[PDB]
Write a protein that binds this ligand. Structure first.
Ligand SMILES: [Mg+2]
Ligand SMILES: [Mg+2]
Lengths: 163, 163
DNA sequence: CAATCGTAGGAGACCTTTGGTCTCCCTGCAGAT
DNA sequence: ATCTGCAGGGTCTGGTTCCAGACCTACGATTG
């Protein structure tokens, strides 16, 4: 009963749920790159692969990863980056033996009753902390919303339910 | 000794050069998927990882990969795709033990004197044929220009010269 | 450090060489033989 | 099948045969 959840973008995270009910969540590793004479943050491929290889989740574990679907009004750099982060994550997960299942944000948001929220990121952190109370301290900052999304993706895949 | 060259886009290829002078080139694996009610070609992650795992090139072999640099006039779908394809290949190569070195198309084109051609893809196929004459039969078609570019990237990395 | 705001954006190599100049794809989808 | 031409484009799910309604992200910058 292992489940993995991945928020693949630059502030994202990977969550790992164990059969005994324990959970781990890891911020996505990144590095600072020079592009067009400015600095950009980019996912750290080797650290991701090393992170996956050190997981105790066995081969065949399912990884639920949020589907890339940027808005037509997002810029072309946004489109490249969501595509790049998605491809790098999917290849790393497959190479590490995990079975990848893409999930639309509409799917897990509806599942946990989070659609049409005035504060979607805050509500995600609140839902994740309720499902994983031992992660409550790791979810108190606004910048922890990627941790929450990864946990909620894993909770969705595991079929967990809010009280 | 061993050198890998990767043209990462959907009609691209991976070339593998051996220390004895032999060469192999494989079209990039792809599948057809439904996106927004139409059919799209997307690289086949699992097939790419299995291909890489089957190479005799040892760990630490350098994989020269063409840097993604879409034009600001290309559509946002082109930007997403080139990012996705790039990320997928980089992670697959890293996970399979290879050292990844991104090369700009202007670098290997200038090295082989191909800059400012009015028929750049035809010229690439001609140059690859001369450098790898046993691949002449595999470079006869217009759609083989991806195979040509992968071979030229690998030949660049190995320091080959046209006669 | 952590949060907020507002728009949606190229990038690279090598020279002219501490800024300038010139170069380079790709995707998606319809058509034609 | 292979190639040519040419413009640069959302995509998804829950509900059916198209509709209705839903969803981000990146990149720079400034505020304490
Ligand atoms: Mg997300
Ligand atoms: Mg290319």
């Amino acid at each position: 009963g292992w489940v993995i959840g991945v928020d693949p973008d630059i502030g994202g995270a990977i969550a790992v749920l164990s059969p005994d009910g324990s959970s781990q969540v890891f911020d996505n590793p990144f590095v600072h790159i020079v592009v067009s004479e400015v600095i950009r943050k980019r996912l750290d491929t080797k650290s991701i692969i090393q992170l996956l290889r050190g997981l105790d989740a066995p081969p065949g574990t399912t990884a639920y990863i949020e589907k890339s679907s940027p808005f037509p009004t997002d810029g072309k750099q946004g489109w490249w980056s969501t595509g790049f982060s998605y491809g790098l994550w999917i290849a790393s997960l497959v190479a590490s033996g995990f079975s990848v299942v893409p999930i639309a944000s509409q799917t897990w948001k509806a599942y946990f009753g989070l659609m049409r929220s005035e504060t979607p990121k805050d509500d995600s952190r609140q839902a994740a902390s309720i499902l994983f109370p031992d992660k409550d301290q790791s979810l108190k900052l606004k910048k922890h919303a990627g941790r929450a999304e990864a946990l909620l993706l894993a909770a969705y895949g595991k079929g967990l339910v809010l009280p």
